[PDB]
Design a protein around this nucleic acid. Structure first.
Ligand code: ATP
Ligand code: ATP
Ligand code: ATP
Ligand code: MG
Ligand code: MG
Lengths: 305, 130, 250, 229, 290, 337
DNA sequence: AAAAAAAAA
């Protein structure tokens, strides 16, 4: 299952609108998606599969290994102890896909780093006069869980991520995977798992005409095509943002208060429409892309209940 | 102890949201150069304006005026908003208003600009009462 | 072997306060210990006179003679001889039990466990001092040490009775020491009213009659026995003589 | 006390009071000190020394200082209805340490604030150097260092007036209430003696006149006038 | 040979101390102790050294001090009453005068009245302090019973009662005196502590404040404001007269014959005459009984 | 045999010592194969003794205490060899137990920091060391058994199970089986256990008298050591007669374990699959109170329990009886009889 | 490089 999560992963792979705008204003094609769900939903396995299929993917976590954040991998490395270092940098943060599990686990240092890599902002932490900043242009994909370990009937922002709301508002797309006990879905899940176990392989019950190396080729092929923006959707996206602020007029109704006012919502809508044009379409952005981005946002919010 | 303070409150309205949408979409689709920096350096180095006796009366009148508003027809002893910090803020703002345009002595325009720009923030500094 | 000295919270035990909030040790730590003794201070001026006499004697001017006679009359042995004897006994002997002793220990353990349950069902909180199978092993070890003292290759009832006596002392002093911690009190005043009203000074009545009367009424047996023995604990108008039959009013 | 990690320093570091030896320490915002300093101070002033014993190093340091502090009454504005103890949150034992108190209030009088603003403006632009004190700073320092070389004594009538004044000051304050007003100790008598000596020094006189005692008593009484108002 | 630093009371504030090396010949061995401020009269000498020249680049010479006399100056800073290396030593005629004046009637009254001659009243405090600083006789019964022979004194009262002055006089009076105060002392500061020597790199023992108070008095001020963790570490010092350490594989017991004199203030800053002592102070029975 | 009761605990230990097989896929990466068991209970209920027995009877095991361990030194250490003059990694406690079992006591008293070092092992059974210029992944495919006390002195049956256990749910979800034990006071059980414990203490080693303590013995007479089927000397196992049901000795049981862990690799079938899916669907939708929440990973536990039970009876196929017994054991461990 | 004691936050 989880077709919409995989669709969001596809939209993440292609990337959004990029290569700057007039008069030097900065825009990034990277998409930031945070996944929420209870333990035991195979979100970690999905992240591992994404890292496998993405050649630029990197997996990190809060400590466990020290030389992965805020420090260069060559610090104090040479036998001469030449103190080779770039200063403030991350692991392959240039055009990389950073994947993190237990997003609430990391300490203040890695939290500061992930806040510093916001919106293609370079890391300029200095210690001994070094300022060789790493130009971080990366897409952030993280998975986390509430501290309760289960969804709660109370106000959903009280569960949130246990992270500052400023960091939460940065993310383009928020998904919530809540486990609902039912017969007609758990039967299918158990049947799928047991049929996988019986064959000791990926079963023929799966029906996929396309292959992982084929996706590896086609993602580069579709990235090469690189459609650009068409102006005819400006009025439609403006009125959609007007209706989004109309929703912001009802965010005080509470119990799913995440429908807050943020220009980054509109920017992410534009980027997602651009990515929808990029994934298959030629050098043209369709209103259907805007509609699909809107539907994806509504589905993202609808998981709150 | 700050010299000034400013507040931004984004509230959802049709007109301003429409204007921001149009403006940012057009950006998505008269500006000087380091000349500004050299002008700033020249003003900081070669310009040392002073205030004049004419503006002293206006300063005193403004201080009294905000002292006048600090009390009303009730003996509650309303909050004393006319602090000496207000005086020093007005003085510095007026002197800086003489700093640009390469002037050497202050005029009235300096003091009215200073008092307007200092009381605009105060008028938005109130809480839910009044 | 661990020999530990400790002081309760708030200095003196403060028996008016509940036993639960007088000891800060958890259940896990207390179970490993198996001989806990509560040394409470007392005042009756006779033990006090005796202690003062003993200290004034134990000053160096007198004890240096008297203690010497303890090695001259054979009452006590020197420390080094005790060390030699104890290491010899540790090396040589290692006793064993007998089936009658096992039966006695089993019955005693069942009895104390049932008594603990009886206290717990009334106090409606968990006991601050637990009784577990570790305690049964403890009594077994105490019996073995008592038999080991006299180099006996087998342990018999003579040592078992002393071990059970010591365990009962160390149990009633700490665990079962006032388990109540101080229908509520409404029946207590009601029960205090009738005995003053119905039974004057100098006369007496059978326990069976009162128990029958206040089981027929609403008081029931559980409330009466506690009230009766606490009116006795007050000890200013109620006296028991002639076994548990004669309820004499002093 | 500080030490480098696995480095044999065991060295003490000097606070502001340590640096202010034989001088004047000026503390601003006295209200928000913490427990350690709040309990070290009332030993620092009265005994003129500080003692510490931590982690194997012990010492007794000199802290001969004169302290001057400023405070802000709780709630922002001083409540004239209450007293010094009611308005201030700082503790009673620290109160007895100090020798003098000064409370200064602002108001909304239109006459005063206009003069205040005018005086500020005059020194800002017109006469930034042309202020008129009766004496120059050099003359002030000359007189200060000349008067510092005098040690006054006390005479018979001075002692009699002093003991009478101390008796009166102990009596009139203790007559107010019990278990609510406790402010006069031997420290007050010592402070009165010190103020008399300082005033005698100011006039460059090797003896003390009961008028100086009267002035010191007036200052101390006005310290208790201020708490009443 | 020993390393000599600068006295913290003599160094200008905020600066660093200066180190020197002192060499003690025969009869001077173990006279000085770690942490004890001393005054040494000696001879200044200089000698050649290799790596000092190597690292400085100039013909510089190392200097050491060959000690000739040592005088202890810990606590008792009053150094004007009499002269000599040890002011606590007596001649034969001084002993004869001691015996002559020790036989007059009412000598205890004169001794009590001669203590702190500039503090008025408080006769009971003077008597208690005299009885505390004269001490008793430790008792040993058959080598298996020990009885403490020192007296502890606790002072409690209102401010402005010259408790600190009396404590300072006691510090000036006793042969061995250690002054602590309030929050300025820690639990492991009074007791002996465990430290790693930077040279030989292994755990060792460092003498605490109480060890310096052995055969002497330990004076504590502001006893109430000291934290409970820093207060519960002197029970053995007041009662068992022994300090036991089991830390970092080091198991040793240290002797401590010290008399503790403490001052404090009651709750609220003043003493409520109409209340019991249990509601006047926050101390408990185990500390009050000692 | 000297522990009274806890029969289901014994069955769980038996199934854990010879757990299921590990799975590797060209696309599915790796699947965990063995079983981990955690027990929580009030003091003096014979947990540490069972842990010592498991140490003694296992092919390979390492004893670890929560307080007396450091997580960084638990996995690997950096030591400089005296001869070569270079620094090389020294194997930690858990790495030595590869393809073994690790027992940890006072688990709830063990420092929180080092807990993450355990979780990594519970994640992919591999520890990564990146320090001082060494970057290596070390295999550690061991099983872990632990016993911990509740937060209070005694278990409160009226409280939230999460409330009684100090460990976070993140690692508690990893353990396949959670057991809660309590010493309910009952005079019948008290008498039975008293008789049993007294019976145990009245024991004497063969050929040695009761008047003197145990003395140390020398090594074997032979420094290096080394008619069939008609004797059954130690094959039947019943050394002493106490019950109609049989018993087996420790050496024969260990030989059985050695044979089973190597000679048989069972394959599951659809008949047990139907029972497994039916009981998972039933247990998930019973909709009543339970000790712990259940999720998709429990079906994996059922599969490997059925595999272990197929291994026990030495069959290459999994029958529905193994599914039934696994479901019964899980219901006991989560519902209670 | 890794374990263990101390004072300040
Ligand atoms: N939809 C699913 N299909 C198949 N297996 C699933 C599914 N959801 C969960 N699983 C199972 O869950 C396990 C992986 O989920 P896992 O618990 O590691 O993820 P998680 O939700 O990030 O939790 P945690 O933080 O506890 O690791 C696997 O054993 C997998 O078989
Ligand atoms: N007879 C006396 N009684 C009390 N104080 C006296 C007496 N004679 C003189 N004084 C003076 O009174 C002051 C009392 O000292 P101090 O303020 O330290 O007392 P304290 O109550 O012990 O102090 P604190 O407890 O605050 O440390 C000293 O300055 C001392 O000179
Ligand atoms: N069912 C039992 N059969 C035999 N002995 C038992 C039984 N239950 C408890 N015991 C005895 O209880 C004692 C306590 O042992 P142990 O400390 O290992 O138990 P535990 O439950 O693990 O306790 P803890 O929580 O303190 O570790 C042992 O001497 C053991 O023999
Ligand atoms: Mg996960
Ligand atoms: Mg145990």
């Amino acid at each position: 299952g989880n077709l919409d999560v995989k669709k969001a992963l596809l939209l993440l792979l292609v990337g959004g609108v990029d290569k700057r705008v007039g008069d030097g204003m900065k825009i990034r094609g990277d998409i930031n998606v945070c996944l929420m769900g209870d333990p035991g939903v195979a979100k970690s396995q999905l992240l591992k599969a994404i890292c496998k299929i993405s050649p630029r993917g990197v997996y990190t976590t809060g400590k466990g290994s020290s030389g992965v954040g805020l420090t260069a991998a060559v610090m104090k490395d040479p036998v001469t102890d030449e103190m080779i270092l770039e200063g403030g940098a991350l692991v392959l943060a240039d055009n990389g896909i950073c994947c993190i599990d237990e997003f609430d686990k990391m300490d203040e240092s890695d939290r500061t780093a992930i806040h510093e890599v916001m919106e293609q902002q370079t890391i300029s932490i200095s210690k001994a006069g070094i300022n060789t900043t790493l130009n971080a242009r990366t897409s952030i994909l993280a998975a986390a869980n509430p501290l309760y370990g289960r969804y709660n009937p109370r106000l959903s922002p009280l569960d949130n991520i246990n992270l500052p709301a400023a960091l939460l508002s940065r993310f383009d797309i928020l998904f919530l995977m809540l486990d609902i006990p039912s017969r007609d879905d758990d039967e299918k899940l158990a049947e799928h798992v047991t049929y996988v176990h019986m064959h000791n392989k990926q079963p023929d019950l799966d029906f996929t005409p396309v292959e992982p190396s084929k996706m590896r080729e086609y993602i580069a092929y579709a990235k090469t095509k690189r459609p650009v923006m068409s102006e005819a959707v400006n009025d439609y996206v403006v009125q959609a943002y007007i209706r989004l602020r109309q929703d912001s007029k009802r965010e005080m109704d509470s119990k799913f208060s995440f429908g807050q006012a943020t220009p980054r919502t509109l920017l992410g809508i534009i980027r997602l429409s651009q990515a929808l044009a990029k994934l298959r379409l030629a050098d043209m952005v369709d209103i259907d892309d805007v509609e699909e981005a809107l539907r994806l946002v509504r589905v993202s919010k609808e998981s709150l209940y | 102890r700050f010299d000034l303070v400013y507040l931004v409150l984004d509230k959802v309205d049709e007109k301003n949201d429409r204007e921001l949408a149009k403006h940012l979409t057009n950006l998505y689709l008269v500006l000087p150069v380091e000349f500004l920096t050299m002008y700033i350096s020249y003003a900081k180095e070669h310009i040392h304006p002073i205030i004049t006796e004419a503006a002293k009366t206006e300063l005193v009148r403004a201080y009294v005026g905000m002292r006048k508003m600090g009390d009303d027809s009730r003996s509650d002893e309303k909050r004393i908003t006319a602090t000496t910090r207000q005086l020093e803020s007005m003085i510095r703002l007026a002197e800086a208003h003489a700093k640009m345009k390469l002037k050497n002595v202050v005029e009235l325009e300096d003091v009215q600009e200073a008092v307007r720009l200092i009381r605009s923030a105060i008028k938005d500094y109130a809480t839910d009462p009044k | 072997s661990v020999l530990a000295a400790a002081n309760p919270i708030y200095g003196r035990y403060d028996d008016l306060k509940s036993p639960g909030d007088n000891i800060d040790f958890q259940t896990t730590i207390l179970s490993r210990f198996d001989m806990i003794f509560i040394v409470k201070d007392d005042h009756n001026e006779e033990r006090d006179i005796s202690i003062a006499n003993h200290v004034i004697n134990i000053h160096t001017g007198n004890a240096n003679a008297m203690q010497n006679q303890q090695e001259e009359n054979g009452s006590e042995i020197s420390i080094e001889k005790m060390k030699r004897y104890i290491t010899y006994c540790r090396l040589k002997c290692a006793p064993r039990l007998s089936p009658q002793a096992a039966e006695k220990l089993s019955s005693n353990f069942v009895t104390i466990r049932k008594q603990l349950l009886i206290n717990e069902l009334e106090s409606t909180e968990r006991s601050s001092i637990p009784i577990t199978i570790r305690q049964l092993e403890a009594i077994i070890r105490i019996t073995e040490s008592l038999a080991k003292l006299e180099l006996s290759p087998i342990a018999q009832e003579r040592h078992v009775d002393e071990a059970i006596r010591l365990f009962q002392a160390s149990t009633m002093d700490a665990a079962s020491q006032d388990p109540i911690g101080g229908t509520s009190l409404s029946e207590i005043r009601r029960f205090e009213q009738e005995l003053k009203r119905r039974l004057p000074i100098g006369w007496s009545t059978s326990y069976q009659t009162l128990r029958r009367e206040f089981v027929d009424t609403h008081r029931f047996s559980q409330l009466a026995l506690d009230k009766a023995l606490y009116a006795l604990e007050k000890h200013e108008t109620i006296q028991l003589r002639h076994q548990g039959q004669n309820i004499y009013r002093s | 006390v500080v030490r480098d990690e696995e480095g044999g320093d065991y060295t003490i570091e000097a606070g502001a009071l340590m640096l202010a030896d034989n001088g004047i320490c000026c503390i601003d915002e006295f209200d928000k000190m913490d427990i350690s300093d709040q309990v070290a101070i009332h030993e620092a002033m009265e005994q003129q020394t500080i003692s510490i014993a931590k982690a194997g190093i012990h010492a007794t340091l000199n802290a001969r200082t004169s302290i001057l502090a400023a405070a802000n009454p709780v709630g922002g504005r001083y409540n004239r209805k209450l007293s010094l103890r009611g308005n201030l949150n700082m503790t009673a034992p620290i109160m007895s340490r100090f020798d003098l108190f000064f409370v200064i209030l602002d108001d909304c009088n239109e006459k005063i604030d206009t003069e205040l603003a005018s005086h500020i403006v005059d020194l800002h632009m017109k006469r930034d150097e042309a202020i008129e004190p009766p004496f120059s700073a050099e003359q002030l320092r000359r007189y200060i260092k000349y008067a510092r070389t005098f040690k006054p004594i006390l005479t018979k009538e001075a002692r009699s007036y002093l003991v009478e004044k101390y008796k009166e000051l102990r009596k009139d304050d203790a007559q107010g209430f019990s278990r609510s007003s406790y402010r006069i100790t031997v420290r007050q008598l010592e402070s009165m003696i010190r103020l008399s000596e300082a005033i005698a020094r100011a006039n460059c006189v090797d003896e003390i006149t009961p008028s100086f005692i009267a002035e010191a008593y007036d200052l101390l009484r006005q310290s208790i006038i201020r708490v009443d108002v | 040979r020993v390393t000599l630093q600068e006295a913290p009371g003599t160094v200008p504030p905020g600066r660093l101390p200066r180190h020197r090396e002192v060499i003690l010949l025969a009869d001077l061995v173990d006279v000085s102790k770690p942490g004890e401020e001393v005054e040494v009269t000696g001879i200044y000498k200089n000698n050649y050294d290799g790596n000092l020249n190597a690292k400085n680049g100039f013909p510089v010479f190392a200097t050491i001090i060959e000690a000739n006399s040592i005088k202890r100056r810990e606590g008792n800073t009053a150094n004007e009453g009499e002269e000599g290396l040890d002011v606590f030593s007596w001649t034969e005629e001084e002993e004869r005068e001691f015996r002559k004046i020790s036989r007059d009637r009412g000598i205890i009254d004169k001794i009590i009245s001669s203590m702190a001659p500039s503090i008025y009243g408080h006769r009971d405090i003077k008597t208690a302090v005299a009885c505390s600083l004269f001490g008793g006789v430790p008792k040993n019964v058959n080598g298996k019973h020990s009885i403490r022979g020192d007296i502890n004194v606790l002072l409690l009262g209102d401010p402005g009662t010259a408790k600190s002055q009396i404590l300072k006089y006691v510090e000036k009076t006793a042969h061995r005196a250690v002054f602590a105060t309030g929050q300025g002392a820690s639990a492991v500061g009074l007791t002996a502590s465990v430290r790693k020597d930077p040279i030989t790199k292994e755990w060792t023992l460092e003498g605490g404040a109480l060890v310096l108070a052995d055969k002497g008095v330990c004076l504590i001020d502001e006893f109430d404001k000291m934290n409970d963790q820093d207060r519960t570490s002197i029970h053995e010092a007041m009662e068992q007269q022994s300090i036991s350490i089991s830390k970092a594989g080091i198991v040793t017991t240290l002797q401590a014959r010290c008399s503790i004199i403490a001052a404090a203030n009651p709750n609220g800053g003043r003493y409520n005459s109409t209340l019991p002592l249990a509601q006047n102070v926050s101390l408990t029975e185990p500390i009050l009984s000692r | 045999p000297s522990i009274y009761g806890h029969d289901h605990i014994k069955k769980a230990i038996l199934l854990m010592l010879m757990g299921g097989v590990e799975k590797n896929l060209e696309n599915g990466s790796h699947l965990r194969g063995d079983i981990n068991i955690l027990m929580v209970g009030d003091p003096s209920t014979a947990k540490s003794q069972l842990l010592r027995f498991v140490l003694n009877t296992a092919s390979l095991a390492i004893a670890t205490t929560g307080r007396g361990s450091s997580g960084v030194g638990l996995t690997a250490a950096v030591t400089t060899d005296r001869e070569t003059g270079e620094r090389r990694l020294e194997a930690g406690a858990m790495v030595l137990a590869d393809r073994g079992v690790v027992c940890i006591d006072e688990f709830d008293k063990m420092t929180d920091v080092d807990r993450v070092a355990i979780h990594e092992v519970m994640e992919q059974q591999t520890v990564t060391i990146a320090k001082a210029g060494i970057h290596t992944t070390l295999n550690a495919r061991c099983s872990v058994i632990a016993a911990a006390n509740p937060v209070f002195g005694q278990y409160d049956v009226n409280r939230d199970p999460h409330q009684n256990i100090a460990l976070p749910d993140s690692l508690l979800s990893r353990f396949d089986l959670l057991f809660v034990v309590t010493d309910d006071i009952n005079e019948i059980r008290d008498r039975s256990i008293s008789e049993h414990v007294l019976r145990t203490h009245r024991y004497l080693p063969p050929g040695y008298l009761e008047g003197e303590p145990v003395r140390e013995r020398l090594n074997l007479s032979l420094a290096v050591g080394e008619q069939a089927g008609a004797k059954l000397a130690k094959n039947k196992g019943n050394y002493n007669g106490t019950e109609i049901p049989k018993l087996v000795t420790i050496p024969f049981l260990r030989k059985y374990v050695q044979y089973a862990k190597e000679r048989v690799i069972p394959q599951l079938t659809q008949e047990a699959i139907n029972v497994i899916v039916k009981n998972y669907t039933d247990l998930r939708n019973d909709d009543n109170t339970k000790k712990s929440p259940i999720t998709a990973r429990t079906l994996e536990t059922l599969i490997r329990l059925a595999t272990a039970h197929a291994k026990v009876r030495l069959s290459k196929t999994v029958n529905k009886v193994d599914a039934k017994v696994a479901a019964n054991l899980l219901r006991f461990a989560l519902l209670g009889e």
